[PDB]
Amino acid sequence: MSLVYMNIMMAFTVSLTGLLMYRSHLMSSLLCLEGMMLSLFILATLMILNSHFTLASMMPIILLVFAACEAALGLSLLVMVSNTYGTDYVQNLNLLQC
Amino acid sequence: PGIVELPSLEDLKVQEVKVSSSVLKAAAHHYGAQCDKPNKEFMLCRWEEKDPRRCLEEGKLVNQCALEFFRQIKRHCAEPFTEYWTCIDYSGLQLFRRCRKEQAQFDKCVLDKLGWVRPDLGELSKVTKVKTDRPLPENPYHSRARPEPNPEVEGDLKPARHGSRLFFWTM
Amino acid sequence: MNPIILIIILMTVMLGTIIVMISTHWLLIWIGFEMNMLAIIPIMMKKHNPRATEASTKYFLTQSTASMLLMMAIIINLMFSGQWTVMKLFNPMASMLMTMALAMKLGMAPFHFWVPEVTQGIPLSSGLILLTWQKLAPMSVLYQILPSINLDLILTLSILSITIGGWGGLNQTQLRKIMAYSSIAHMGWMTAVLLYNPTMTLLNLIIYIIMTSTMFTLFMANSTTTTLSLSHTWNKAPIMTILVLITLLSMGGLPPLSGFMPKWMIIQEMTKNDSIILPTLMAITALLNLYFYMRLTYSTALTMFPSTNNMKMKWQFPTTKRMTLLPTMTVLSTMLLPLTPILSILE
Amino acid sequence: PFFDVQKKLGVDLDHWMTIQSAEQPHRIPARCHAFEKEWIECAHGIGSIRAEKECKIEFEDFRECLLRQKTMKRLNAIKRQRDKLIKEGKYTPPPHHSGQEDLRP
Amino acid sequence: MMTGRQARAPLQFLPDEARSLPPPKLTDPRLAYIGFLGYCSGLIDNAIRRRPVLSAGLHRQFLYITSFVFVGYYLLKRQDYMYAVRDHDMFSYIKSHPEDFPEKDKKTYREVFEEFHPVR
Amino acid sequence: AKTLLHQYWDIPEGTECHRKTYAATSIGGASGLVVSAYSVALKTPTSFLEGVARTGRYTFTAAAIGAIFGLTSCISAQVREKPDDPLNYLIGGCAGGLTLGARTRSYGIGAAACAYMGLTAALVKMGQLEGWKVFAEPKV
Amino acid sequence: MMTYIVFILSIIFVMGFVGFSSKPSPIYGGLGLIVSGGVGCGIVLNFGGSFLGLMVFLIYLGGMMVVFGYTTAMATEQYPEVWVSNKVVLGTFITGLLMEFLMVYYVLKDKEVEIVFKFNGMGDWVIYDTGDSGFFSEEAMGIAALYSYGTWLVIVTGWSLLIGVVVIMEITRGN
Amino acid sequence: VAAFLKNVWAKEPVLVASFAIAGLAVILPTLSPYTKYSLMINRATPYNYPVPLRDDGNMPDVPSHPQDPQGPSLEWLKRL
Amino acid sequence: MNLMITLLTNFTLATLLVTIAFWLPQLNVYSEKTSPYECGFDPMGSARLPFSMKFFLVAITFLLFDLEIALLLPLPWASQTTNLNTMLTMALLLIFLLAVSLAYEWTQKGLEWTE
Numbered sequence A: 001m002s003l004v005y006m007n008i009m010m011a012f013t014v015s016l017t018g019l020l021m022y023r024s025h026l027m028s029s030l031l032c033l034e035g036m037m038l039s040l041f042i043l044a045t046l047m048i049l050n051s052h053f054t055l056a057s058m059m060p061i062i063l064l065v066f067a068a069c070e071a072a073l074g075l076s077l078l079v080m081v082s083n084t085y086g087t088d089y090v091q092n093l094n095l096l097q098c
Numbered sequence B: 001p002g003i004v005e006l007p008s009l010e011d012l013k014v015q016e017v018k019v020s021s022s023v024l025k026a027a028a029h030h031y032g033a034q035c036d037k038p039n040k041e042f043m044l045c046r047w048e049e050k051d052p053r054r055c056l057e058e059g060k061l062v063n064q065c066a067l068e069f070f071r072q073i074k075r076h077c078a079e080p081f082t083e084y085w086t087c088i089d090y091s092g093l094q095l096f097r098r099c100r101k102e103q104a105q106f107d108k109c110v111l112d113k114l115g116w117v118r119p120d121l122g123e124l125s126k127v128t129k130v131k132t133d134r135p136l137p138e139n140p141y142h143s144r145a146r147p148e149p150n151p152e153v154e155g156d157l158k159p160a161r162h163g164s165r166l167f168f169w170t171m
Numbered sequence C: 001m002n003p004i005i006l007i008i009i010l011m012t013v014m015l016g017t018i019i020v021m022i023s024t025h026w027l028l029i030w031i032g033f034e035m036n037m038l039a040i041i042p043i044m045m046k047k048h049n050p051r052a053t054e055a056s057t058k059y060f061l062t063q064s065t066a067s068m069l070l071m072m073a074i075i076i077n078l079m080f081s082g083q084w085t086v087m088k089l090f091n092p093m094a095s096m097l098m099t100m101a102l103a104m105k106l107g108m109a110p111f112h113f114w115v116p117e118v119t120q121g122i123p124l125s126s127g128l129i130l131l132t133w134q135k136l137a138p139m140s141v142l143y144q145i146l147p148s149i150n151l152d153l154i155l156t157l158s159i160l161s162i163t164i165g166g167w168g169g170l171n172q173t174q175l176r177k178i179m180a181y182s183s184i185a186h187m188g189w190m191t192a193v194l195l196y197n198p199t200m201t202l203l204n205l206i207i208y209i210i211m212t213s214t215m216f217t218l219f220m221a222n223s224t225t226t227t228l229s230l231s232h233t234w235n236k237a238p239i240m241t242i243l244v245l246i247t248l249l250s251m252g253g254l255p256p257l258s259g260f261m262p263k264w265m266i267i268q269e270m271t272k273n274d275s276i277i278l279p280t281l282m283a284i285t286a287l288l289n290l291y292f293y294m295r296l297t298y299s300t301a302l303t304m305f306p307s308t309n310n311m312k313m314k315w316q317f318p319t320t321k322r323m324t325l326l327p328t329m330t331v332l333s334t335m336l337l338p339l340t341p342i343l344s345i346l347e
Numbered sequence D: 001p002f003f004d005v006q007k008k009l010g011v012d013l014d015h016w017m018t019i020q021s022a023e024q025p026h027r028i029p030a031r032c033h034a035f036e037k038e039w040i041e042c043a044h045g046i047g048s049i050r051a052e053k054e055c056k057i058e059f060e061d062f063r064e065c066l067l068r069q070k071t072m073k074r075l076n077a078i079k080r081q082r083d084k085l086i087k088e089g090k091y092t093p094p095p096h097h098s099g100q101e102d103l104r105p
Numbered sequence E: 001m002m003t004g005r006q007a008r009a010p011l012q013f014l015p016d017e018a019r020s021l022p023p024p025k026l027t028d029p030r031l032a033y034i035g036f037l038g039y040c041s042g043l044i045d046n047a048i049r050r051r052p053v054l055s056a057g058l059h060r061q062f063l064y065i066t067s068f069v070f071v072g073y074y075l076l077k078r079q080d081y082m083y084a085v086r087d088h089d090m091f092s093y094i095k096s097h098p099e100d101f102p103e104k105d106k107k108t109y110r111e112v113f114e115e116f117h118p119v120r
Numbered sequence F: 001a002k003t004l005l006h007q008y009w010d011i012p013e014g015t016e017c018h019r020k021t022y023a024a025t026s027i028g029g030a031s032g033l034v035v036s037a038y039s040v041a042l043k044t045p046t047s048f049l050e051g052v053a054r055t056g057r058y059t060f061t062a063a064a065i066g067a068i069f070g071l072t073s074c075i076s077a078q079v080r081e082k083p084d085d086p087l088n089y090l091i092g093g094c095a096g097g098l099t100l101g102a103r104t105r106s107y108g109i110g111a112a113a114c115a116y117m118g119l120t121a122a123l124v125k126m127g128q129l130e131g132w133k134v135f136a137e138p139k140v
Numbered sequence G: 001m002m003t004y005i006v007f008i009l010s011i012i013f014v015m016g017f018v019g020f021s022s023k024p025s026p027i028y029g030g031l032g033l034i035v036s037g038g039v040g041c042g043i044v045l046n047f048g049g050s051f052l053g054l055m056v057f058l059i060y061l062g063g064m065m066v067v068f069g070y071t072t073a074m075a076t077e078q079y080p081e082v083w084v085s086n087k088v089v090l091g092t093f094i095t096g097l098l099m100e101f102l103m104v105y106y107v108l109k110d111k112e113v114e115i116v117f118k119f120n121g122m123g124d125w126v127i128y129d130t131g132d133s134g135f136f137s138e139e140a141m142g143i144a145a146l147y148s149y150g151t152w153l154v155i156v157t158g159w160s161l162l163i164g165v166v167v168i169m170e171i172t173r174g175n
Numbered sequence H: 001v002a003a004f005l006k007n008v009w010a011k012e013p014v015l016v017a018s019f020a021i022a023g024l025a026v027i028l029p030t031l032s033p034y035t036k037y038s039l040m041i042n043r044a045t046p047y048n049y050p051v052p053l054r055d056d057g058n059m060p061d062v063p064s065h066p067q068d069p070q071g072p073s074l075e076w077l078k079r080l
Numbered sequence I: 001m002n003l004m005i006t007l008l009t010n011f012t013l014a015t016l017l018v019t020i021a022f023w024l025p026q027l028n029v030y031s032e033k034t035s036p037y038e039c040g041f042d043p044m045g046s047a048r049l050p051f052s053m054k055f056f057l058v059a060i061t062f063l064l065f066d067l068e069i070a071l072l073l074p075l076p077w078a079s080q081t082t083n084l085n086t087m088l089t090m091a092l093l094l095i096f097l098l099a100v101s102l103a104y105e106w107t108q109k110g111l112e113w114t115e
């Protein structure tokens, strides 16, 4: 297939491995979920604008909506981690190991 | 697969309408009135054949009928039309609303010297019927035999033979 | 929580599962999963302690990663098929990514690393919601894409889930982690029979949901979250020890109980397809699940662990709890095996 | 559990964004409308197992409409052979592939 | 297996052709076992709330029995329908494909040679 | 590494011992790399040197198991002249189990791995003979 | 090399993704994600989606301003890692960049490449439509159809945003 | 209802104006005779090409020319 | 093309007003003038301490309300449709759902700041 899908899928995989390998800091990986949403947006939108399947043009908007509709969720779940502990480090969330 | 079959370069040579887009847009309503029939035969052939290679000859009729539209403007009303497409040609979006006095002069000179009525608001968007002698294409998608569907269910539904037959359940 | 808000949030969890179940479009599947996760996060944080916040963070990260992989599988299907219908997938890469996404959403091994954590962190009612109602939407999507599921992938996920969920519960004294590794092993049983006969997948799902809802309703009715607090039940309500006895012996796959019903039928559908080694290893590995079930029956019903003095006060107070459908679910989880050919209604 | 509520109740919740050949706003066609219409009218009702092998040709034409892989591979071959013949000097491009050609309309 | 059968008529618990089948009797032993499950649910319900198990709540035990018999009647109707569909599709597929199901010629045991394995 | 097991099994038994030993060595090395990857994943090594030490230790352990398995199996198929015979892989699996015991530096793990890996390799040979399917394709 | 403009913007997209995916600090993570979401509205704007690129630019600008406020309020350390302070950040940053320009080099020299899928190496101008859409941009018509055709999608999206507000106010309570 | 309305107009008048404008925007398009003409203008705006019909022989309502009397007209939009 | 030329010109003579702002005057660097500013006295602690956000619930709800102007924004184009009462109903449904959201955030004191 076309050349740009290589790099947009590459950016998805880069953001995937960035999300899936934590650096002990939860906000730095909540950016990686938002980057995966960006890469899925641009990939789906290139496919939809390419093929002129115009009725799915409303699809990435909807996709983008649920992007922040979980990203806000993560931030609402970031502040409860950072109120229990002074930092949002992910290694403070190990109480459920026993 | 197969060789794609394209027409030759001599098959595509026709006397083009070598005028600009403002010249076309200025004469557009009278073109839609007077050059109705070969244009609609062509667009009917174009949506029915779904292939431009089977639409060249009718298309040439379009390129035959447009030029005779303009020569009949050029023989009679060349100067009011020239002023009118110049005034249309000035604008960026090419507004009809900025050029109503040259439009009135052009429509008056055309209606006097040639007897053409300008189409009103709503007429050129009508769906019209076209009388052609070319055959209706029986397979414009170049499709093939659709596969045979699975056989339906028929017959009265009898009870299950000896129940469920699940290892020992006798019902 | 304000009970109007609790009603609206639980109806939104149900709405997300229904939107996954009824929709023919992939974007609506993804919307249903997003709505399901988004609404179930405050059910986990109903109590506002650090363990519920940790469980909700781990659950959000796992389910968000799974939904990313799901939408990437959807977009690759859009490329290689030009359409959005919820049916088989037209690319093995999208098939793998969607199978990984649904295996993460089920908590099947080796993506199982959140189910004991999240199940221990949250209450017993929200743990019941997690282990039963959240196992309905990915099993819908797995029921719908089985012409494209890789055989080796779903069988590796299935037997790896059965083995890891067997070994995990042996080292547990917390009841919620026991039910979570039990969940892992049972989802392995359900997905192993998925490509052979998905009616048996639905049968195992329904019998599992009945038995798990019975066990969580018994835990809530006794207010027990550890093994050693479940062991005081003989001194307080001795009928509950009988009910956890019959339900835990049912969950181990022992005849003549209904939890023997799915397992046997799964074996009954895997030997038809000339697979003899795999359901044999699955059956033998289910003895580990049976072993920690038998450990709980030893601590609760078959012996009498020593109680405390303050139990004498709880003799004077009956249960005012809504033990909703507990006798119905206890009868259905134990005495349903003579009605085994009822599974044909799931065809 | 495909509880087909949309066909039971007769409602159209999401059948409209399902395929490219559906009813589009202002009758806009997709670039692969004919290929997808041929593939769907081939594979309708015959089930997926017969559709994966009896409608393989229409689905190959439709997939090669979508991603244009054979077309871009053929253009790779044509452009690479053209660049090789330019590099060897054994071919010169015509004037209508350089600009000075007094284009059609 | 039979998922493509119930796709032209979706979400029908009992279709119209299910009325061409004999319904279960009200003295069906499967239905009597489901009623016994209702009675056992009533007994467990009186047991866990520490009521007298046989004497308390006869209206409640009777609605347990009535509700299980009522649900189980339609469950047995759908069960018998799906097995009748299974047999109907089996027989129609055997009839529509004779080349896949040849008529076997059962040889008698005077021509069938079996190797004798002596137990000594 | 679907092709690793294929290039192990595409060779007749008791014919070319070095290539069988190398193929089983590579199968063991891939298994040891998988175990090493999950081992440095779930249990954090204290340093990068300790991580590559655990990786090399598990990889050389499983590769030595594979090497001695393939060597013992093909040498037994040569000296016994019975290539389609599960007793060859029983002896090879016990040799691999003694290898695993010598790598874990204990006799009881060696005897237990001898018994169970010999039975496992015997069952693998019987599955190659009668065509047993563990990941069986759905037929009905 | 101007026909490769969508490819060049896509290289800058992957460079921004390696920038914030190495996770230096969410200040510079927000920087890299703004750079990627700002060249990604130049990738997709050259396909005809001028509405649908400006929105992923604008929504993510609001998003990274919010994320900035939180990483200055919650995710803050005394010495934030810029791009090069940690060896594990700089190592995987250089690794992602070298592997990205490696698959640039293998796709411009060979004009084909294969990582899991097969990809062309010609400029992606080749796949555009040779026609015109008239007096409507078709992506604007399709997003306008969210109100006429997308009624169920409106209902589930508006309900999800409503319960998103309700869910977030139920989480961020503490008691 | 009038005393509460005066109270909320005295305390929160921005919200009173908000609910008034919102209530008008809800109820008033259902009470206007011109909402029909919105739809009639929008479906008489010719974006696409009016693809002609093959004359089978029996279509009395379809014209053969745009200046023919039969067919859909837009005199209602010219007058209004 | 012209857009990238214009942005290149703007960025170029915004960065060439900086390179002649640093390199043109005479520099006198000593390690007290480049110190941070705390009204003359030395700053107590770093400014990289967590500065706690009081408006955090409003900041998260801004992420949700900013999506609404990705949904309410096609209304000038949605008004051009030929299924127009349905469009009007869905538009008023989206603004009404935004308003119900804002009312819920009001009455549960989500718009107020903490402390």
Ligand SMILES: CCCCCCCCCCCCCCCCCC(=O)OC[C@H](COP(=O)([O-])OC[C@H](O)COP(=O)([O-])OC[C@H](COC(=O)CCCCCCCCCCCCCCCCC)OC(=O)CCCCCCCCCCCCCCCCC)OC(=O)CCCCCCCCCCCCCCCCC
Pocket (backbone or CB within 6 Å): B168, B169, B170, B171, C256, C337, C338, C339, E027, E028, E029, E030, E032, E033, E036
């Ligand atoms: C004028 C118009 C009106 C006229 C009315 C005339 C009639 C008036 C009465 C109507 C009401 C029905 C009365 C019963 C009808 C006959 C049913 C019968 O005996 O079937 C024999 C049935 C098959 O025998 P058969 O020699 O092939 O055929 C004789 C009939 O013609 C069999 O005929 P079939 O071919 O039609 O039978 C169908 C099929 C035939 O059976 C089969 O295809 C074989 C497979 C059956 C299921 C096997 C499951 C095995 C694994 C689970 C085992 C669970 C534990 C075992 C029990 C432990 C105790 C709880 O049965 C089933 O599919 C149903 C499942 C079995 C339920 C039987 C009905 C029980 C009702 C009362 C429940 C009381 C508790 C019963 C025990 C609970 C467990 C069932 O026997 C068994 O399966 C063995 C178990 C014994 C059956 C139940 C005995 C009923 C009377 C119990 C009185 C004492 C209760 C003491 C308290 C409760 C226990 C603690």
